[PDB]
Amino acid sequence: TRNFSLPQLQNLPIEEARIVADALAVHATSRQIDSAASKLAALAEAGLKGDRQAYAAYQQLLYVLSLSDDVATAQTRRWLARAIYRVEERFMPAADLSRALSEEDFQKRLEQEIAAQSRERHPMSQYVFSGSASRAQLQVFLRHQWFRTFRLYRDAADLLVNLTDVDEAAALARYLYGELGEEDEKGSHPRLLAKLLEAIGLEADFQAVSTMPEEIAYLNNRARAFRHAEVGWGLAVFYITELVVPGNHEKLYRALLQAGLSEDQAEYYKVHISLVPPRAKREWQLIARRIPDVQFQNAFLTSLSQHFRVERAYYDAIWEEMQSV
Amino acid sequence: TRNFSLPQLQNLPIEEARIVADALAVHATSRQIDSAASKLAALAEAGLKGDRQAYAAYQQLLYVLSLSDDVATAQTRRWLARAIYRVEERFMPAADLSRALSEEDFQKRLEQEIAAQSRERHPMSQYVFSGSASRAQLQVFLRHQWFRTFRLYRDAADLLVNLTDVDEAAALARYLYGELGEEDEKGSHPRLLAKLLEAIGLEADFQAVSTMPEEIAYLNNRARAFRHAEVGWGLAVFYITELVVPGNHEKLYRALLQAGLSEDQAEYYKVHISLVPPRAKREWQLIARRIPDVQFQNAFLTSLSQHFRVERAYYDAIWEEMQSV
Ligand SMILES: O=C(O)C[C@@H](SC/C=N/O)C(=O)O
Ligand SMILES: O=C(O)C[C@@H](SC/C=N\O)C(=O)O
Ligand SMILES: [Fe+3]
Ligand SMILES: [Fe+3]
């Protein structure tokens, strides 16, 4: 299977890929697993210090560890990913406020950060919204839309698991329920996107494996953020996504209709326009309750800044692919 | 913080509790974590061979590891819990099937197992249904009902996390949505039970920590099964609970109304009578697809039998406590 860990690892011409493979064996010893964790940590350190090959190598290995679908190795894979996450977060630039911002000041900082970094301001977004994109160019856009959308519900579920307050788990459960099609699994949002992809000649593969480095970096970061033990990381990515999807999707919907798509064909984008603003308003209380905590504020803001960095490098790479077709 | 891991460990007169504490430290080394794992596995092995003190020790530590609420230590706690689970599973009388049973023989064996040991036939259940229980004795019953209900949704979420198929994750999402109150979190099933609990004088403590050995055994086993990498373990526990809840809760509902509180206060039991039956028919498909796989059948039936042994010993202990008042 294409999105299992071991087939992906055999395809990486890296020695650490074989050490990781040994660490994921059914009878792997603690020493093999600690060896994998140390060599992964050193690879990530070398890559984050400026070694372009170690940088690419650890990002590919981290993609395999964090996002493969062979559930038998999942617990050890998540253990190994943590060895890499620890290194990454030491290199990330951390927000270090010592005193908590006011709730009003905090929301305004978010609004400002969004206005400065929103995916909606990217030249590619504006260009498609303009109607000037070719059909093959929309296909580039939707090919990568598939990778962003199709397993988002799993990252949300990792955050659900880490919210110990029953009311906060419930808010995330309502999100997951909406995201998985409510009472009809034929209408889960991954399948709505699949219906749109098929309307424009693309396959929606639930075992899709990305080969674009910036997309891998985006998916790796998002999973790390939603899985973090300090939920400020995950609430940052979750909530910024909830705030940006409605207007972005309203313009993407219009662009697809302009591009020769039906209302039903473009339903994936249509349903978020109306489903999200109410839910986003109720989900805000998860952030409001934690604002007095300066550790939460620093985790949230560091998460947000890191998310924006990888999202921008990713949109830039999609934009380049779109221009070459 | 009464149900966080470190405060619980400092209150355990078990030597290995200190080693576990060291393993959960912010900067714990691989040696300290691996050491803790080794001592926990040895303690479990001694306990399952008959050392009652080692048995009690491994069960209290496993309770702290698997069910404490400080998410900062959860990943390492779940890692250490695995070392105990592997030992436990070597001692479980597993259905040794060499080849897969037919669907016909699988459902028949399932029906037979449920017929022989369902919780509904336990003398305490028929006694409660009988009307004859005193208020103090119903308090005993509901005090332990709290421990079974108040974090069940978390165990189901771990199973959701391990269901890689999007339509099957959707099925578990429909379950969680219902269990956490659909659009209204004040109606989540833990809070409905908490309201039933407020009537009669009992506290519903979201940080409750059990000190009843058979109850610890029940919660430990259930979390292990729902977290297992082979989803047969969790599907076994999940499905046996969904199938028995409607009849059991129907009879408990009528008995509680006959004990003098309204239908609405006892809403926790009524809602299951109608809510669960339609969802159980769709949830069966997750099991039907896997019947042909003998590895699934062996996990499922081993889990069912282990769940019934632990459920029966727990119900026995509640019944003894109930008869002491
Ligand atoms: O990549 C991301 O995280 C943003 C997704 S949001 C789709 C679903 N929203 O509920 C996108 O590309 O639109
Ligand atoms: O874990 C158990 O023993 C089963 C629970 S069912 C609660 C289900 N939804 O609220 C019980 O004891 O009634
Ligand atoms: Fe969505
Ligand atoms: Fe329920």
Side-chain angles (χ1 to χ4, degrees), chain A residues 34 71 76 78 82 151 154 164 167 174 183 185 191 229 282, chain B residues 30 71 76 82 151 154 162 164 167 174 182-183 185 191 282:
Chain A
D34 184 20
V71 79
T76 302
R78 286 183 181 225
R82 197 240 289 262
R151 299 309 188 179
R154 295 181 178 167
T164 41
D167 288 355
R174 298 189 295 265
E183 293 308 342
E185 72 277 5
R191 289 199 177 287
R282 197 138 49 128
Chain B
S30 82
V71 302
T76 300
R82 211 243 241 99
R151 302 304 192 179
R154 294 183 178 166
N162 279 337
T164 47
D167 293 347
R174 299 188 225 111
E182 308 194 60
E183 287 305 298
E185 74 279 358
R191 287 198 183 289
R282 300 187 262 182

PDB file of all heavy atoms in Angstrom, chain A residues 34 71 76 78 82 151 154 164 167 174 183 185 191 229 282, chain B residues 30 71 76 82 151 154 162 164 167 174 182-183 185 191 282:
ATOM      1  N   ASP A  34      15.342   3.878  20.031  1.00  0.00           N
ATOM      2  CA  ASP A  34      16.119   5.039  20.464  1.00  0.00           C
ATOM      3  C   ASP A  34      17.189   5.421  19.447  1.00  0.00           C
ATOM      4  O   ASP A  34      17.458   6.613  19.253  1.00  0.00           O
ATOM      5  CB  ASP A  34      16.792   4.829  21.816  1.00  0.00           C
ATOM      6  CG  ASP A  34      17.523   6.116  22.298  1.00  0.00           C
ATOM      7  OD1 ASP A  34      17.205   7.232  21.800  1.00  0.00           O
ATOM      8  OD2 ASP A  34      18.416   6.032  23.172  1.00  0.00           O
ATOM      9  N   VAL A  71      -1.684   1.470  10.631  1.00  0.00           N
ATOM     10  CA  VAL A  71      -2.042   1.867  11.963  1.00  0.00           C
ATOM     11  C   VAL A  71      -1.193   1.048  12.973  1.00  0.00           C
ATOM     12  O   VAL A  71      -0.945   1.511  14.098  1.00  0.00           O
ATOM     13  CB  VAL A  71      -3.586   1.668  11.996  1.00  0.00           C
ATOM     14  CG1 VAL A  71      -4.000   0.145  12.185  1.00  0.00           C
ATOM     15  CG2 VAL A  71      -4.440   2.851  12.632  1.00  0.00           C
ATOM     16  N   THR A  76       4.519   3.895  17.406  1.00  0.00           N
ATOM     17  CA  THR A  76       5.968   4.114  17.357  1.00  0.00           C
ATOM     18  C   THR A  76       6.334   5.241  16.373  1.00  0.00           C
ATOM     19  O   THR A  76       7.179   6.102  16.680  1.00  0.00           O
ATOM     20  CB  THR A  76       6.610   2.772  16.981  1.00  0.00           C
ATOM     21  OG1 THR A  76       6.212   1.826  17.976  1.00  0.00           O
ATOM     22  CG2 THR A  76       8.122   2.832  16.920  1.00  0.00           C
ATOM     23  N   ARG A  78       4.487   7.890  15.813  1.00  0.00           N
ATOM     24  CA  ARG A  78       4.287   9.164  16.478  1.00  0.00           C
ATOM     25  C   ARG A  78       5.374   9.420  17.505  1.00  0.00           C
ATOM     26  O   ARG A  78       5.801  10.569  17.675  1.00  0.00           O
ATOM     27  CB  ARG A  78       2.923   9.228  17.152  1.00  0.00           C
ATOM     28  CG  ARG A  78       1.812   9.391  16.138  1.00  0.00           C
ATOM     29  CD  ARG A  78       0.479   9.534  16.837  1.00  0.00           C
ATOM     30  NE  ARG A  78      -0.621   9.668  15.904  1.00  0.00           N
ATOM     31  CZ  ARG A  78      -1.579  10.575  16.049  1.00  0.00           C
ATOM     32  NH1 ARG A  78      -1.531  11.442  17.071  1.00  0.00           N
ATOM     33  NH2 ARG A  78      -2.576  10.619  15.194  1.00  0.00           N
ATOM     34  N   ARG A  82       8.031  12.666  17.427  1.00  0.00           N
ATOM     35  CA  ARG A  82       8.228  13.614  18.511  1.00  0.00           C
ATOM     36  C   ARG A  82       9.703  13.967  18.625  1.00  0.00           C
ATOM     37  O   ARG A  82      10.053  15.124  18.899  1.00  0.00           O
ATOM     38  CB  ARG A  82       7.682  13.035  19.807  1.00  0.00           C
ATOM     39  CG  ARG A  82       7.456  14.065  20.897  1.00  0.00           C
ATOM     40  CD  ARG A  82       8.294  13.712  22.089  1.00  0.00           C
ATOM     41  NE  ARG A  82       7.828  12.526  22.822  1.00  0.00           N
ATOM     42  CZ  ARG A  82       7.087  12.570  23.924  1.00  0.00           C
ATOM     43  NH1 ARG A  82       6.712  13.728  24.446  1.00  0.00           N
ATOM     44  NH2 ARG A  82       6.721  11.446  24.512  1.00  0.00           N
ATOM     45  N   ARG A 151      -7.579  14.792   4.685  1.00  0.00           N
ATOM     46  CA  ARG A 151      -7.415  14.241   6.037  1.00  0.00           C
ATOM     47  C   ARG A 151      -7.389  15.324   7.122  1.00  0.00           C
ATOM     48  O   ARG A 151      -6.776  15.121   8.177  1.00  0.00           O
ATOM     49  CB  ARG A 151      -6.155  13.385   6.165  1.00  0.00           C
ATOM     50  CG  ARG A 151      -6.079  12.148   5.270  1.00  0.00           C
ATOM     51  CD  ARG A 151      -7.304  11.238   5.319  1.00  0.00           C
ATOM     52  NE  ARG A 151      -6.972  10.043   4.565  1.00  0.00           N
ATOM     53  CZ  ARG A 151      -7.766   8.982   4.372  1.00  0.00           C
ATOM     54  NH1 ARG A 151      -8.978   8.897   4.927  1.00  0.00           N
ATOM     55  NH2 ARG A 151      -7.305   7.962   3.649  1.00  0.00           N
ATOM     56  N   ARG A 154      -8.746  14.295  10.462  1.00  0.00           N
ATOM     57  CA  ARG A 154      -7.922  13.539  11.428  1.00  0.00           C
ATOM     58  C   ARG A 154      -7.119  14.478  12.331  1.00  0.00           C
ATOM     59  O   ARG A 154      -6.986  14.235  13.543  1.00  0.00           O
ATOM     60  CB  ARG A 154      -6.981  12.608  10.692  1.00  0.00           C
ATOM     61  CG  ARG A 154      -7.696  11.491   9.896  1.00  0.00           C
ATOM     62  CD  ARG A 154      -6.579  10.693   9.281  1.00  0.00           C
ATOM     63  NE  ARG A 154      -7.004   9.540   8.513  1.00  0.00           N
ATOM     64  CZ  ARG A 154      -6.182   8.875   7.701  1.00  0.00           C
ATOM     65  NH1 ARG A 154      -4.923   9.305   7.561  1.00  0.00           N
ATOM     66  NH2 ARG A 154      -6.629   7.825   6.983  1.00  0.00           N
ATOM     67  N   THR A 164      -9.242  18.051  27.381  1.00  0.00           N
ATOM     68  CA  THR A 164      -9.740  17.207  28.459  1.00  0.00           C
ATOM     69  C   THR A 164     -11.100  17.680  28.971  1.00  0.00           C
ATOM     70  O   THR A 164     -11.878  16.866  29.497  1.00  0.00           O
ATOM     71  CB  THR A 164      -8.756  17.185  29.624  1.00  0.00           C
ATOM     72  OG1 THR A 164      -8.233  18.503  29.842  1.00  0.00           O
ATOM     73  CG2 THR A 164      -7.561  16.260  29.273  1.00  0.00           C
ATOM     74  N   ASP A 167     -16.749  19.915  27.572  1.00  0.00           N
ATOM     75  CA  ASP A 167     -17.429  20.866  26.684  1.00  0.00           C
ATOM     76  C   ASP A 167     -16.545  21.239  25.500  1.00  0.00           C
ATOM     77  O   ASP A 167     -17.033  21.374  24.363  1.00  0.00           O
ATOM     78  CB  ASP A 167     -17.783  22.132  27.460  1.00  0.00           C
ATOM     79  CG  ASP A 167     -18.917  21.926  28.446  1.00  0.00           C
ATOM     80  OD1 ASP A 167     -19.543  20.828  28.516  1.00  0.00           O
ATOM     81  OD2 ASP A 167     -19.111  22.868  29.242  1.00  0.00           O
ATOM     82  N   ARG A 174     -18.572  18.499  17.300  1.00  0.00           N
ATOM     83  CA  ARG A 174     -19.533  19.109  16.379  1.00  0.00           C
ATOM     84  C   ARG A 174     -18.836  19.504  15.094  1.00  0.00           C
ATOM     85  O   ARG A 174     -19.386  19.314  13.993  1.00  0.00           O
ATOM     86  CB  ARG A 174     -20.225  20.319  17.010  1.00  0.00           C
ATOM     87  CG  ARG A 174     -21.057  20.050  18.259  1.00  0.00           C
ATOM     88  CD  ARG A 174     -21.856  21.311  18.636  1.00  0.00           C
ATOM     89  NE  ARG A 174     -21.005  22.443  19.029  1.00  0.00           N
ATOM     90  CZ  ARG A 174     -20.692  22.729  20.300  1.00  0.00           C
ATOM     91  NH1 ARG A 174     -21.143  21.956  21.292  1.00  0.00           N
ATOM     92  NH2 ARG A 174     -19.925  23.773  20.598  1.00  0.00           N
ATOM     93  N   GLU A 183     -25.136  13.164   8.964  1.00  0.00           N
ATOM     94  CA  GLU A 183     -25.749  11.846   8.958  1.00  0.00           C
ATOM     95  C   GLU A 183     -25.461  11.051   7.693  1.00  0.00           C
ATOM     96  O   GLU A 183     -25.724   9.845   7.674  1.00  0.00           O
ATOM     97  CB  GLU A 183     -27.269  11.989   9.061  1.00  0.00           C
ATOM     98  CG  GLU A 183     -27.797  12.533  10.389  1.00  0.00           C
ATOM     99  CD  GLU A 183     -27.323  11.840  11.650  1.00  0.00           C
ATOM    100  OE1 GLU A 183     -26.823  10.690  11.610  1.00  0.00           O
ATOM    101  OE2 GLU A 183     -27.454  12.499  12.711  1.00  0.00           O
ATOM    102  N   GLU A 185     -22.515   9.944   5.172  1.00  0.00           N
ATOM    103  CA  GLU A 185     -21.104   9.884   4.833  1.00  0.00           C
ATOM    104  C   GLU A 185     -20.831  10.151   3.350  1.00  0.00           C
ATOM    105  O   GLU A 185     -19.694  10.474   2.998  1.00  0.00           O
ATOM    106  CB  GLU A 185     -20.557   8.566   5.400  1.00  0.00           C
ATOM    107  CG  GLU A 185     -20.973   7.268   4.720  1.00  0.00           C
ATOM    108  CD  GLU A 185     -22.359   6.810   5.236  1.00  0.00           C
ATOM    109  OE1 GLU A 185     -22.996   7.546   6.033  1.00  0.00           O
ATOM    110  OE2 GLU A 185     -22.778   5.678   4.914  1.00  0.00           O
ATOM    111  N   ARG A 191     -15.295  13.894   0.469  1.00  0.00           N
ATOM    112  CA  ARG A 191     -15.999  13.355  -0.688  1.00  0.00           C
ATOM    113  C   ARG A 191     -16.632  14.448  -1.541  1.00  0.00           C
ATOM    114  O   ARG A 191     -16.644  14.323  -2.774  1.00  0.00           O
ATOM    115  CB  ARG A 191     -17.051  12.342  -0.213  1.00  0.00           C
ATOM    116  CG  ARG A 191     -16.446  11.050   0.304  1.00  0.00           C
ATOM    117  CD  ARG A 191     -17.482   9.951   0.312  1.00  0.00           C
ATOM    118  NE  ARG A 191     -16.970   8.644   0.732  1.00  0.00           N
ATOM    119  CZ  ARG A 191     -16.184   7.859  -0.006  1.00  0.00           C
ATOM    120  NH1 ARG A 191     -15.819   8.233  -1.230  1.00  0.00           N
ATOM    121  NH2 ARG A 191     -15.778   6.684   0.468  1.00  0.00           N
ATOM    122  N   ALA A 229       0.935  18.667  22.678  1.00  0.00           N
ATOM    123  CA  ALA A 229       0.390  18.560  24.028  1.00  0.00           C
ATOM    124  C   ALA A 229      -0.030  19.903  24.617  1.00  0.00           C
ATOM    125  O   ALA A 229      -0.840  19.924  25.542  1.00  0.00           O
ATOM    126  CB  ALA A 229       1.394  17.857  24.937  1.00  0.00           C
ATOM    127  N   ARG A 282     -18.817  30.003  17.839  1.00  0.00           N
ATOM    128  CA  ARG A 282     -18.856  29.199  19.062  1.00  0.00           C
ATOM    129  C   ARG A 282     -17.489  28.641  19.443  1.00  0.00           C
ATOM    130  O   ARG A 282     -17.184  28.532  20.635  1.00  0.00           O
ATOM    131  CB  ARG A 282     -19.866  28.063  18.961  1.00  0.00           C
ATOM    132  CG  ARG A 282     -20.176  27.534  20.349  1.00  0.00           C
ATOM    133  CD  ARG A 282     -21.647  27.242  20.589  1.00  0.00           C
ATOM    134  NE  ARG A 282     -22.256  26.441  19.536  1.00  0.00           N
ATOM    135  CZ  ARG A 282     -22.939  25.328  19.781  1.00  0.00           C
ATOM    136  NH1 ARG A 282     -23.083  24.909  21.036  1.00  0.00           N
ATOM    137  NH2 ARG A 282     -23.472  24.636  18.782  1.00  0.00           N
TER     138      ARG A 282
ATOM    139  N   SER B  30      16.007   8.852  27.336  1.00  0.00           N
ATOM    140  CA  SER B  30      15.567   7.548  26.865  1.00  0.00           C
ATOM    141  C   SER B  30      15.870   6.425  27.870  1.00  0.00           C
ATOM    142  O   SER B  30      15.045   5.517  28.046  1.00  0.00           O
ATOM    143  CB  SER B  30      16.251   7.214  25.553  1.00  0.00           C
ATOM    144  OG  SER B  30      17.548   6.702  25.824  1.00  0.00           O
ATOM    145  N   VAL B  71      -2.268  16.378  29.834  1.00  0.00           N
ATOM    146  CA  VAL B  71      -1.875  15.986  28.470  1.00  0.00           C
ATOM    147  C   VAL B  71      -0.361  16.135  28.229  1.00  0.00           C
ATOM    148  O   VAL B  71       0.195  15.454  27.355  1.00  0.00           O
ATOM    149  CB  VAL B  71      -2.666  16.821  27.427  1.00  0.00           C
ATOM    150  CG1 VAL B  71      -4.183  16.634  27.628  1.00  0.00           C
ATOM    151  CG2 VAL B  71      -2.296  18.273  27.564  1.00  0.00           C
ATOM    152  N   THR B  76       4.069  10.032  26.686  1.00  0.00           N
ATOM    153  CA  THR B  76       4.968   9.099  27.349  1.00  0.00           C
ATOM    154  C   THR B  76       4.185   8.134  28.203  1.00  0.00           C
ATOM    155  O   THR B  76       4.485   6.926  28.223  1.00  0.00           O
ATOM    156  CB  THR B  76       6.023   9.842  28.163  1.00  0.00           C
ATOM    157  OG1 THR B  76       6.793  10.674  27.275  1.00  0.00           O
ATOM    158  CG2 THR B  76       6.939   8.877  28.870  1.00  0.00           C
ATOM    159  N   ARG B  82       1.887   0.889  27.003  1.00  0.00           N
ATOM    160  CA  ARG B  82       1.994  -0.184  26.025  1.00  0.00           C
ATOM    161  C   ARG B  82       2.819  -1.339  26.581  1.00  0.00           C
ATOM    162  O   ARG B  82       2.498  -2.513  26.346  1.00  0.00           O
ATOM    163  CB  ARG B  82       2.595   0.340  24.721  1.00  0.00           C
ATOM    164  CG  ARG B  82       2.086  -0.389  23.523  1.00  0.00           C
ATOM    165  CD  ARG B  82       3.206  -1.076  22.870  1.00  0.00           C
ATOM    166  NE  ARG B  82       3.398  -0.595  21.500  1.00  0.00           N
ATOM    167  CZ  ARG B  82       4.309   0.301  21.129  1.00  0.00           C
ATOM    168  NH1 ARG B  82       5.147   0.833  22.029  1.00  0.00           N
ATOM    169  NH2 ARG B  82       4.381   0.646  19.845  1.00  0.00           N
ATOM    170  N   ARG B 151     -16.087   9.355  31.000  1.00  0.00           N
ATOM    171  CA  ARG B 151     -15.083   9.528  29.942  1.00  0.00           C
ATOM    172  C   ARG B 151     -15.153   8.469  28.849  1.00  0.00           C
ATOM    173  O   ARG B 151     -14.165   8.267  28.130  1.00  0.00           O
ATOM    174  CB  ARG B 151     -13.657   9.496  30.514  1.00  0.00           C
ATOM    175  CG  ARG B 151     -13.368  10.545  31.591  1.00  0.00           C
ATOM    176  CD  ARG B 151     -13.641  11.946  31.127  1.00  0.00           C
ATOM    177  NE  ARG B 151     -13.087  12.891  32.091  1.00  0.00           N
ATOM    178  CZ  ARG B 151     -13.154  14.212  31.963  1.00  0.00           C
ATOM    179  NH1 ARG B 151     -13.754  14.740  30.902  1.00  0.00           N
ATOM    180  NH2 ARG B 151     -12.643  14.997  32.900  1.00  0.00           N
ATOM    181  N   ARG B 154     -14.085   9.551  25.385  1.00  0.00           N
ATOM    182  CA  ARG B 154     -12.651   9.618  25.052  1.00  0.00           C
ATOM    183  C   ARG B 154     -12.146   8.293  24.499  1.00  0.00           C
ATOM    184  O   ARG B 154     -11.297   8.256  23.578  1.00  0.00           O
ATOM    185  CB  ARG B 154     -11.819   9.980  26.279  1.00  0.00           C
ATOM    186  CG  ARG B 154     -12.046  11.375  26.851  1.00  0.00           C
ATOM    187  CD  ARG B 154     -11.093  11.591  28.007  1.00  0.00           C
ATOM    188  NE  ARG B 154     -11.160  12.921  28.624  1.00  0.00           N
ATOM    189  CZ  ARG B 154     -10.593  13.173  29.805  1.00  0.00           C
ATOM    190  NH1 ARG B 154      -9.957  12.170  30.422  1.00  0.00           N
ATOM    191  NH2 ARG B 154     -10.640  14.381  30.368  1.00  0.00           N
ATOM    192  N   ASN B 162      -8.024   5.610  15.268  1.00  0.00           N
ATOM    193  CA  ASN B 162      -7.357   4.481  14.607  1.00  0.00           C
ATOM    194  C   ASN B 162      -8.120   3.905  13.400  1.00  0.00           C
ATOM    195  O   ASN B 162      -7.628   2.960  12.775  1.00  0.00           O
ATOM    196  CB  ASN B 162      -7.143   3.369  15.634  1.00  0.00           C
ATOM    197  CG  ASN B 162      -5.921   3.599  16.514  1.00  0.00           C
ATOM    198  OD1 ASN B 162      -4.983   4.314  16.151  1.00  0.00           O
ATOM    199  ND2 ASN B 162      -5.938   2.981  17.696  1.00  0.00           N
ATOM    200  N   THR B 164      -8.710   4.307   9.843  1.00  0.00           N
ATOM    201  CA  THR B 164      -8.129   5.094   8.755  1.00  0.00           C
ATOM    202  C   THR B 164      -9.114   5.379   7.622  1.00  0.00           C
ATOM    203  O   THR B 164      -8.958   6.388   6.909  1.00  0.00           O
ATOM    204  CB  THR B 164      -6.944   4.358   8.128  1.00  0.00           C
ATOM    205  OG1 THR B 164      -7.294   2.991   7.873  1.00  0.00           O
ATOM    206  CG2 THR B 164      -5.693   4.431   9.089  1.00  0.00           C
ATOM    207  N   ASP B 167     -15.074   6.811   5.701  1.00  0.00           N
ATOM    208  CA  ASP B 167     -16.485   6.546   5.998  1.00  0.00           C
ATOM    209  C   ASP B 167     -16.658   5.877   7.360  1.00  0.00           C
ATOM    210  O   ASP B 167     -17.644   6.147   8.073  1.00  0.00           O
ATOM    211  CB  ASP B 167     -17.106   5.655   4.915  1.00  0.00           C
ATOM    212  CG  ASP B 167     -17.204   6.340   3.572  1.00  0.00           C
ATOM    213  OD1 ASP B 167     -17.025   7.581   3.500  1.00  0.00           O
ATOM    214  OD2 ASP B 167     -17.450   5.623   2.577  1.00  0.00           O
ATOM    215  N   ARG B 174     -20.296  10.157  14.080  1.00  0.00           N
ATOM    216  CA  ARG B 174     -21.709  10.272  14.395  1.00  0.00           C
ATOM    217  C   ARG B 174     -21.953   9.813  15.817  1.00  0.00           C
ATOM    218  O   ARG B 174     -22.658  10.488  16.586  1.00  0.00           O
ATOM    219  CB  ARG B 174     -22.544   9.416  13.431  1.00  0.00           C
ATOM    220  CG  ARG B 174     -22.431   9.800  11.963  1.00  0.00           C
ATOM    221  CD  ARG B 174     -23.427   9.065  11.058  1.00  0.00           C
ATOM    222  NE  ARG B 174     -22.644   8.639   9.908  1.00  0.00           N
ATOM    223  CZ  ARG B 174     -22.343   7.381   9.626  1.00  0.00           C
ATOM    224  NH1 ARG B 174     -22.779   6.409  10.409  1.00  0.00           N
ATOM    225  NH2 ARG B 174     -21.576   7.102   8.577  1.00  0.00           N
ATOM    226  N   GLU B 182     -24.821  16.452  20.495  1.00  0.00           N
ATOM    227  CA  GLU B 182     -25.180  16.968  19.168  1.00  0.00           C
ATOM    228  C   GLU B 182     -24.865  18.459  19.136  1.00  0.00           C
ATOM    229  O   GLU B 182     -23.708  18.820  19.401  1.00  0.00           O
ATOM    230  CB  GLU B 182     -26.629  16.553  18.858  1.00  0.00           C
ATOM    231  CG  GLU B 182     -26.830  15.048  19.060  1.00  0.00           C
ATOM    232  CD  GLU B 182     -28.127  14.501  18.466  1.00  0.00           C
ATOM    233  OE1 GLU B 182     -28.300  14.622  17.235  1.00  0.00           O
ATOM    234  OE2 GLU B 182     -28.973  13.963  19.219  1.00  0.00           O
ATOM    235  N   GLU B 183     -25.837  19.350  18.940  1.00  0.00           N
ATOM    236  CA  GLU B 183     -25.529  20.775  18.867  1.00  0.00           C
ATOM    237  C   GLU B 183     -25.483  21.473  20.220  1.00  0.00           C
ATOM    238  O   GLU B 183     -25.017  22.618  20.283  1.00  0.00           O
ATOM    239  CB  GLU B 183     -26.575  21.492  17.976  1.00  0.00           C
ATOM    240  CG  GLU B 183     -26.415  21.215  16.490  1.00  0.00           C
ATOM    241  CD  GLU B 183     -25.012  21.552  15.999  1.00  0.00           C
ATOM    242  OE1 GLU B 183     -24.641  22.742  16.089  1.00  0.00           O
ATOM    243  OE2 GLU B 183     -24.253  20.631  15.597  1.00  0.00           O
ATOM    244  N   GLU B 185     -23.964  21.262  24.012  1.00  0.00           N
ATOM    245  CA  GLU B 185     -23.084  20.531  24.928  1.00  0.00           C
ATOM    246  C   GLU B 185     -23.642  20.356  26.348  1.00  0.00           C
ATOM    247  O   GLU B 185     -23.165  19.474  27.066  1.00  0.00           O
ATOM    248  CB  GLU B 185     -21.725  21.212  25.012  1.00  0.00           C
ATOM    249  CG  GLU B 185     -21.713  22.489  25.808  1.00  0.00           C
ATOM    250  CD  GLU B 185     -22.217  23.675  25.022  1.00  0.00           C
ATOM    251  OE1 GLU B 185     -22.556  23.511  23.827  1.00  0.00           O
ATOM    252  OE2 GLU B 185     -22.295  24.768  25.617  1.00  0.00           O
ATOM    253  N   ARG B 191     -23.014  14.882  31.119  1.00  0.00           N
ATOM    254  CA  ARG B 191     -23.752  15.881  31.886  1.00  0.00           C
ATOM    255  C   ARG B 191     -25.192  15.484  32.182  1.00  0.00           C
ATOM    256  O   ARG B 191     -25.717  15.817  33.257  1.00  0.00           O
ATOM    257  CB  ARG B 191     -23.693  17.227  31.175  1.00  0.00           C
ATOM    258  CG  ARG B 191     -22.356  17.863  31.285  1.00  0.00           C
ATOM    259  CD  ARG B 191     -22.471  19.353  30.978  1.00  0.00           C
ATOM    260  NE  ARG B 191     -21.187  20.056  30.985  1.00  0.00           N
ATOM    261  CZ  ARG B 191     -20.464  20.314  32.071  1.00  0.00           C
ATOM    262  NH1 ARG B 191     -20.874  19.909  33.267  1.00  0.00           N
ATOM    263  NH2 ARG B 191     -19.316  20.979  31.950  1.00  0.00           N
ATOM    264  N   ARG B 282     -25.949   0.699  11.416  1.00  0.00           N
ATOM    265  CA  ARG B 282     -24.878   1.165  10.530  1.00  0.00           C
ATOM    266  C   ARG B 282     -23.492   0.827  11.058  1.00  0.00           C
ATOM    267  O   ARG B 282     -22.567   0.624  10.267  1.00  0.00           O
ATOM    268  CB  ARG B 282     -24.924   2.659  10.239  1.00  0.00           C
ATOM    269  CG  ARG B 282     -26.156   3.161   9.571  1.00  0.00           C
ATOM    270  CD  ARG B 282     -25.946   4.607   9.200  1.00  0.00           C
ATOM    271  NE  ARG B 282     -26.497   5.592  10.107  1.00  0.00           N
ATOM    272  CZ  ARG B 282     -26.413   6.894   9.856  1.00  0.00           C
ATOM    273  NH1 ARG B 282     -25.792   7.303   8.748  1.00  0.00           N
ATOM    274  NH2 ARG B 282     -26.943   7.782  10.690  1.00  0.00           N
TER     275      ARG B 282
END
